[PDB]
Curated annotation (Swiss-Prot):
Tissue expression notes: Highly expressed in subcutaneous adipose tissue.
Induction: Up-regulated during adipogenesis and obesity. Induced either in muscle after exercise or in adipose tissue upon cold exposure (at protein level). Expression is induced by Ppargc1a isoform 4.
Family affiliation: Belongs to the meteorin family.
Superkingdom of origin: Eukaryota
Function summary: Hormone induced following exercise or cold exposure that promotes energy expenditure. Induced either in the skeletal muscle after exercise or in adipose tissue following cold exposure and is present in the circulation. Able to stimulate energy expenditure associated with the browning of the white fat depots and improves glucose tolerance. Does not promote an increase in a thermogenic gene program via direct action on adipocytes, but acts by stimulating several immune cell subtypes to enter the adipose tissue and activate their prothermogenic actions.
Organism: Mus musculus
Disulfide bond positions: C1-C73, C4-C97, C14-C119
Coiled coil spans: none
Native organism taxonomy: Eukaryota, Metazoa, Chordata, Craniata, Vertebrata
Subcellular location: Secreted
Name of the gene: Metrnl
PTM entry text: N-glycosylated.
Protein name per UniProt: Meteorin-like protein
Length: 124
C-alpha cells in the first residue's frame, strides 16, 4: 500500500499494460477476494490491453472502465485526478501505481529535464 517510488512510476509508464489519466467514479469492495473494484472515468488514454476502457457515449472525450486494487488501498482511495498504471490478466485490470496527477506531472518534468525517463508520454 506504499505508493510506487518515482523510479517505479517512470518504468511503469513505459512497460505497464495500461496507462491512463482520470478520476474515480465509484468504488465497490469485494471482501471475499480482499480487493476493491475502482470504477474510473478516463480523460486521457495512453495505452491499454483487452479493451478494459471503452468510450462513454454521453461523455465525449472520456472512457469508462474498472480496475482492481488491494482492499487496504481501496478504503482510502482518495480524491481528485490520478495517473493510473497497471497490468491486465485474463481481461481484468489490476492497479500498479496511482500517483496524484499533479504530483506525477512534476516528477515527470524533472525526470525529463534530467534525461532519465526511459520513455516519453504526453497526458496533456
Amino acid at each position: 500500500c506504499r505508493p510506487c517510488s518515482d523510479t517505479e512510476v517512470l518504468l511503469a509508464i513505459c512497460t505497464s499494460d495500461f496507462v491512463v489519466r482520470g478520476f474515480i467514479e465509484d468504488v465497490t469492495h469485494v471482501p471475499e477476494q480482499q480487493v476493491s473494484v475502482i470504477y474510473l472515468r478516463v480523460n486521457r488514454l495512453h495505452r491499454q490491453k483487452s479493451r478494459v476502457f471503452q468510450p462513454a457515449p454521453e461523455d465525449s472525450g472520456h472512457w469508462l472502465g474498472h480496475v482492481t486494487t488491494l482492499l487496504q488501498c481501496g478504503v482510502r482511495p482518495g480524491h481528485g485526478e490520478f495517473l493510473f498504471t497497471g497490468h491486465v490478466h485474463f481481461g481484468e485490470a489490476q492497479l500498479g501505481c496511482a500517483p496524484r496527477f499533479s504530483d506525477f506531472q512534476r516528477m515527470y518534468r524533472k525526470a525529463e529535464e534530467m534525461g532519465i525517463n526511459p520513455c516519453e508520454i504526453n497526458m496533456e
